[PDB]
Amino acid sequence: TPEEKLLRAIFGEKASDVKDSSLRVPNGVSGTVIDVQVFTRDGVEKDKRA
């Protein structure tokens, strides 16, 4: 579509599509987070949180 050309040819968002697949919290339960882990092999440079 011309909108995609307008956005990625100017703003630079050349990803350019999107598809949300966020890990949703299971429905109907509260809670709190106590620990987080990051596992990554030596193929991708880890981010600042890692």
Binding site: K5, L6, F11, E13, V18
Partner: protein
């Protein structure tokens, strides 16, 4: 700003409706709004994209106001005396600048802003393609089935909206059906210039009948008038240019080709083939089709006439409910009253007597020879000065004394004709409550001088439309004087 924004600005199928700089700025404003939403403060941001290379610079505005709070939202100079007040207090001119914005997370907001900008650009293109030429005055088709409305498509992806009175009284449209109409009131609208299509006037068939006309558009006959109305009357006529051209056959096309041409979506009513001419007697007799020529009358000063036809075509010659009034109101050039055949018989009973009964004593003559002149010639014993001797003094006998009725007004103009303006000598005099009431023109004293009411207190209990049937004022203008008189006395503490 990488020599690629121009390639997107110049699509150029539809993105070139505005200028390249203008089209770029149309999306740059939305991008600046998205960045400001992503920005912490609600400062006015003005981002301009250069058309040459897409240099998306940002020279934000200060949006300064008289407020002494939120300096980012509104700059100040009076409280900024340390800055020496370089400008006035409340200068909303561009006095800020930004550098760049990525907004990767805000890509959804950027896409929404781009969609809004695209909708605005499409609306602007539709406006510049339709409203410049007054929508689209051409036969088209509809693609929407709505309630008392229709969306008619046209060229350059136009979309006009049909008014309430566009379709006929029983006309209906569905998805795929076509309801033709004249669209001339093209007004701006969001996401497409929705024009106003309405076929309820004579213009719905004024020019449509000339397409199939054999002499109107063939440089052989001129178009006098054509009156199209919804359901009541519809008469199409072409004036013959003194060349024995068909005044009704051409209007009907080819033996009725144009009769049903304007009866489809121009109002639903069938356009009768009336005739148009230039003769004083053929102006309306031939225009009263379908009927017979039976009315020959014309006024002296104004373009007035009288309708008098056979008993079998009372509703077809003129019509009591306007069935053929439009056939004699516009395509005739004269004004006539729709009535029965008595218009040719009873019209000479009171007209000849009104001007003769009152003058039974103003002519210095007896009543024995006063009515004899009127009986010999009706409408002859009145205004014997303007007319010459060929039409006013052609009678024998007392030819010399026949100019008495005209010479009586030489110096006695305030003797016999003085009763038309001296009705407020002893009674019905003007008052200061209704005759001189403010809210109307100088002719507002007639309702008080011809009714006999001394004061407005006798009608102060009335509402608004108490005298709506009178000819001295409108429906709601009759009670204005009473309301003013009541208000001048209810709270008249201050003088």
């Amino acid at each position: 700003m990488n020599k690629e924004i121009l390639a997107v600005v110049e699509a150029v199928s539809n993105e070139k409706a505005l200028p390249r700089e203008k089209i770029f700025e149309a999306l740059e404003s939305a991008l600046a709004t998205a960045t400001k939403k992503k920005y912490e403060q609600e400062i006015d941001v003005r981002v301009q994209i250069d058309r040459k290379s897409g240099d998306f610079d940002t020279f934000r505005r200060w949006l300064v106001v008289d407020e002494v709070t939120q300096p980012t939202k509104e700059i100040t100079l009076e409280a900024a005396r340390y800055e020496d007040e370089s400008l006035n207090l409340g200068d909303y001119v561009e006095d800020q600048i930004e550098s760049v914005t990525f907004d990767r997370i805000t890509t959804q907001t950027a896409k929404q802003v781009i969609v809004q900008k695209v909708r605005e650009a499409e609306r602007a293109m539709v406006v510049d393609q339709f409203r410049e030429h007054e929508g689209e005055i051409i036969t088209g088709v509809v693609k929407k089935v709505n309630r008392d409305n229709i969306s008619l498509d046209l060229g350059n992806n136009a979309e006009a909206v049909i008014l309430r009175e566009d379709m006929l009284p029983r006309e209906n449209f569905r998805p795929g059906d076509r309801v033709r109409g004249v669209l001339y009131s093209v007004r701006p609208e969001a996401r497409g210039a929705q024009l106003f299509v309405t076929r309820s006037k004579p213009e719905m068939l004024i020019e449509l009948f000339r397409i199939e006309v054999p002499e109107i558009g063939e440089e052989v006959i001129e178009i006098k008038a054509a009156a199209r109305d919804p359901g009541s009357r519809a008469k199409i006529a072409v004036k013959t240019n003194d060349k024995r051209i068909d005044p009704v056959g051409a209007c009907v096309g080819m033996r009725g080709a144009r009769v049903q041409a304007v009866s489809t979506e121009l109002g639903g009513e069938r356009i009768d083939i009336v005739l148009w001419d230039d003769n004083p007697a053929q102006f309306v007799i031939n225009a009263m089709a379908p009927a017979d020529v039976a009315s020959i009358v014309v006024d002296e000063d104004k373009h007035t006439m009288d309708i008098a036809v056979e008993a079998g075509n009372l509703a077809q010659a003129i019509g009591r409910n306007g069935q053929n009034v439009r056939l004699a109101s516009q395509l005739s050039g004269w004004e006539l009253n729709v009535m029965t055949v008595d218009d040719l018989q009873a019209k000479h009973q009171a007209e000849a007597h009104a001007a003769i009964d009152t003058f039974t004593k103003y002519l210095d003559i007896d009543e024995d020879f006063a009515t004899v002149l009127v009986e010999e010639g009706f409408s002859t014993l009145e205004e014997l000065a303007y007319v010459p001797m060929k039409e006013l003094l052609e009678i024998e006998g007392l030819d010399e004394p026949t100019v008495e009725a005209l010479r009586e007004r030489a110096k006695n103009a305030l003797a016999t004709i003085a009763q038309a303006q001296e009705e407020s000598l002893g009674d019905n005099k003007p008052a200061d409550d209704l005759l001189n009431l403010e809210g109307v023109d100088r002719d507002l004293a007639f309702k008080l001088a011809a009714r006999g009411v001394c004061t407005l207190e006798d009608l102060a209990e009335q509402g608004i439309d108490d005298l709506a049937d009178i000819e001295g004022l409108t429906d709601e203008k009759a009670g204005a004087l009473i309301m003013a008189a009541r208000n001048i006395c209810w709270f008249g503490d201050e003088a």
